């Protein structure tokens, strides 16, 4: 899963 999601979850 992309960092943009990983970092904001």
């Amino acid at each position, epitope marked *: *899963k*992309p*960092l*943009e*999601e*990983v*970092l904001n979850l």
Partner: antibody
Amino acid sequence: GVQLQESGPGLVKPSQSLSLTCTVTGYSITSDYAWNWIRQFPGNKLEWMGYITYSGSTGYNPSLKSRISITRDTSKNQFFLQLNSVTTEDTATYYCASYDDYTWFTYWGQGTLVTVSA
Amino acid sequence: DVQMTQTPLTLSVTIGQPASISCESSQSLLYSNGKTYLNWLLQRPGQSPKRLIYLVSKLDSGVPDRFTGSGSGTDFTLRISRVEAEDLGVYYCVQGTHFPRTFGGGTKLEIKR
């Protein structure tokens, strides 16, 4: 100096475990972003190894999951890479880098040469 | 494991002339959230990779107008309007929508003189 720095042995005998350190200067490794480890093999070939997020979460490259491990020391603001059971194939240039893939923040270190040989 | 293919393997440009590099991914890099995580890196001799473009077309700071990125889905294009001496080095293409993240085989740019 600079912003990101790799330190560690430059030589490691096969079968043992490699251990690298990335000292981060200028920004808190707990604030934001993903702190990765990338390595460049003799041929310009780049391989992302894994990262550890500002929250302690880790992600590893499946080709390495078994023998890879990434940790950090939030007090000394630095993160580590532990690669076990190295072989001469693990010889390469190791870089630590920070980025999130969607904002302006992007920094690579200068990298360290790690050669595996008896 | 998603492959990224770049062409040409080498590129010989005269200073002042325009240049363009291509990158093909084995799968669409479009993410369900609409964005497509594709970045461009330049590695100058004796230095570590430097990101030039992110999100297919956004230029990183300190990067000149000369560099433009474009494409979508599976095909991407890095283009330099006017090549400069300082533009020599190897260009990498990298994706971040599929796990693990993957790099391109690189494209070496040599100044013809």
